[PDB]
From Swiss-Prot, chains A, B, C, D, E, F:
Compartments (UniProt record): Cytoplasm
Free-text disruption phenotype from the record: Little effect on miRNAs levels. Plants lacking both RICE1 and RICE2 have reduced miRNAs levels and lower miRNA retained by AGO1, thus leading to the up-regulation of targeted mRNA transcripts.
Domain of life: Eukaryota
GO process terms (BP): positive regulation of miRNA metabolic process; regulatory ncRNA-mediated gene silencing
Keywords, sorted A to Z: Cytoplasm, Hydrolase, Nuclease, RNA-mediated gene silencing
GO annotation, cellular component aspect: cytoplasm; plant-type vacuole
Spans annotated as Oligomerization: 35-65, 101-126, 165-172
UniProt function note: 3'-to-5' exoribonuclease (RNase) specifically targeting single-stranded RNAs. Triggers miRNA accumulation in RNA-induced silencing complex (RISC), composed of miRNAs and AGO proteins, by degrading uridylated cleavage fragments. Required during plant growth and development.
EC number per UniProt: 3.1.13.1
Family label: Belongs to the RICE family.
Name of the protein in its database record: Protein RISC-INTERACTING CLEARING 3'-5' EXORIBONUCLEASE 2
Tissue and organ distribution: Restricted to shoot and root apical meristems, trichomes, and vascular veins.
Length: 200, 200, 200, 200, 200, 200
């Protein structure tokens, strides 16, 4: 079965985030995990999917960058996909999913990521939003456009970030589970950022 | 006579949308069905045609995307065209239809769609509107620009979408007629979004 | 010699449009008819020439499109030029005419038109306006920028459009004469839209 | 030495304009006349040189257009240069003059012109202004951005244009002297348009 | 036991900036130094890292600019990385650090620098801010966008800059240790600029 | 010694500008003059270096333009550099100087210049401002954006320009010393324009 059976993390408001990490090879089917993210976004998440992307920088000069991980978060769930190089056709499901108009893909500082995706992979996100910009405009606070994930969450929600900070402050030491925890937390924070702004 | 004799769907307001689905070959003549769409738009639909487009992702990096379906909706009708690869001359009628200045082509999150259509197929929509941005500006609510089809309808119309949600929440398991039902509902919803915006 | 001796149409306000349709061969001198359009625009029409362009869609993916005809409308005149493929030298006068700063070329939804003209035919309109945007601004009505010919004329002039609609609603069943009629009427309508806007 | 020894024209305000026309061939020395335009602009014209450019259209699709005339007008003068195809080294002086920051080059509908000039001839105008857009912003009248030479003068200066209209209405029938006259009058008008915007 | 054990400098407010200069070779590990920068920014700097870059100009005409060194500043620390000609794999740490969304990279007059980094090295800073622009907008003082490092510090902070000026005035005769001092001072100045703008 | 021992000009207000003109060959060291310009800017001229550039025009079509003089002005100095074609390596010092963030390079109508420098020479000015746009926005006077050097100074400062006017009106007849004189006066005028705008 497909379930989010990696570690659960408890957020500062007492809620839990269920997690799943997949190493995608040439024949891994991620489609059932993408379906759960989508189903959860529609039933429970007001049709947002919060995301982040990670690159393997390879030695035109940015051509060498290749997408090595994708995080997809909803209120309840965090799916972390580790991707191979190169892609095989099983990754067509990720492309079809990122092109969907069922949900909005919400990210932080994604302007360059979107060009890299399109130019290096032909991956297109039809319904994306770079959320600092919306935050800045909704709040009339110009600097929110220029904040990283933690700091945007801080200036929008003012919640406790002590756990997230202590992991990030020592990132090079942090184990794979603590890195996953930091990713899951940031996903939840941005989920909350978005719920806050889309209702204001 | 050419008619929309496919499944009929009843909208939350009690109206009935008539559908037609066409599998376009090398020979299908789609002319009579585009004429019906055009006629209903002019006579009953205030010269709006609502649309959506569906791509087959093939692997310059976006140049492998190929348009695999097109939806065209008016209040009364929903024409769904499944298209081949490559196109044959009989699809010239569709290029001519989409170039028309008789009606306005209303879409949701179509900015990338327009560029792919243009770059990959030479298909030009001379009179299009990416409807979310007009919504945000008319209603003075920034977030509307960044919403997918369902959620835009929700935030502009505040009508009941339980049926729509239930189908899309289980997309990968929905049969073709349910998926058509969802396409027809979304068509009708954005028709109503447009009618509400053009007039206010 | 030269004159607008084609069909003459009566507009809803009782005025008339004279028309002329020429099949441009390799030999045709179109200068005299261009001269009459320019004369009528300067002496009677406040130096507006209203225009529309009609494409043969052919199979850079848009580089297949070919200018099949041009409509030029003034106060009293509608000239319809049907063009060959490829163009001959005698079409140089149309290039000079369209480049003129004596008059403003007023069109509806011409942004893509102008790109296709320049890219495919090296045809440059130095003094063009895509008139819906001016309408929208001049009048604080956002949707006008995104309307087609008929609906823009409707929303700006509020005049009788029953006859135009009946021809357009069944475009496919319209003879060359009724299609010319619709073109003449739309030309006349957009002359009026322009006269009206240029005073606000 | 060299002087503006062609016809002189009376303007509707009772001033005069002196005129010079030259057909430039490979040995022509135009520098004495540019120095006169420059001197008159600096001492008499508040450092504006009004201009227009004229193209031999030609079979990338616009790369065959070639600059065929240039007009330079000041307070008192109007210099009309007819150019060869191709240019010779003696035209270097025109390139340098057009690059000067001693004066502002004030033009009407020159956006495509500037692109053609750069791309086809490498001619750069470092200090140029497409004056209808400044007219529109300065006056808060949107339409001024979208007007031709005569019409923009009409709508800023509201002066008598019967003479200019009579020539341009019959343009195809006007002799070279009458064409020169219209160029000189339009030069004078945009001079006065400029005076009106700059100290507003 | 990595530590910032190069020269330390006393700022005008009595605080001390500790520095470290690394000559990066084919095998140097810089991750412990970057980690100290990141740790200090998160725990003490509110997630800002101030930066500047230094180019070797070489003789696509800008393709010969080569990145020679980079400075990364927090209030407490200033790291200088002196870069080799062939970057090896050990420099990927730097690419990943500059790509981070944990912190915001704050620079002065960095628009060209970002294009050059991207074009010549494939180095992308996903979360960057050209701080002069924010200061101009924040303070409503237009000229701030167009100031160099010292002058922006002056116009925002009004602190004593005699020591900095004295080194910069004689820049070519200042030895490497004073040039290093000037760089550390400017890093501290801009940290201070940012701390004002980010929550005032 | 490196000193500004060319003609010294007295300005309208009793201040003086010292000049130096250098015919840069393949071997000339210009760095002691650059250091003098930078020192003066830092110590006495509020970190502005006013500049202008002069092109040898060329027969892509603008790729033949070649930089032939550069003028650099400060509070007290005007350096005028005449460059060879092609450059040799001794000009790397000028590329370094122009990339400095110690000062602001203030220019009048330099938008095309910056593009030609980059495209043709790979010369990058990291901290440049096209000052007319700042003047227009600062002063709420639209037309300043479109003025050449003298007229901008006039409209910002309102000082006496008879001497400058007298030389430029007869530019083709002025000796090399009178042309320097004009270049020096223009430098001093924009220095003052900048000091004035810097305070608003």
């Amino acid at each position: 079965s497909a379930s989010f059976d990696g570690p659960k993390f408890k957020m500062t408001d007492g809620s839990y985030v269920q997690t799943k990490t997949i190493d995608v090879g040439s024949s891994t089917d991620i489609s059932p995990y993408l379906s759960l993210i989508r189903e959860d976004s529609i039933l429970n998440g007001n049709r947002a999917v919060i995301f982040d992307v990670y690159w393997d920088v390879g030695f035109t000069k940015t051509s060498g960058w290749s997408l090595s991980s994708v995080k997809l978060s909803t209120r309840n769930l965090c799916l972390f996909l580790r991707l191979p190089k190169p892609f095989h056709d099983n990754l067509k499901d990720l492309y079809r999913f990122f092109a969907s108009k069922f949900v909005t893909f919400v990210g932080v500082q994604i302007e360059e990521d979107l060009d890299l995706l399109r130019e290096n992979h032909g991956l297109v996100i039809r319904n994306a939003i770079n959320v600092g910009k919306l935050a800045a405009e909704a709040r009339g606070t110009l600097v929110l456009e220029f904040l990283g994930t933690r700091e945007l969450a801080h200036r929008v929600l003012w919640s406790d970030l002590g756990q997230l900070d202590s992991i990030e402050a020592k990132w090079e030491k942090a184990g794979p589970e603590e890195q996953l925890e930091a990713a899951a937390i940031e996903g939840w924070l941005i989920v909350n950022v978005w719920d806050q702004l889309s209702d204001e």
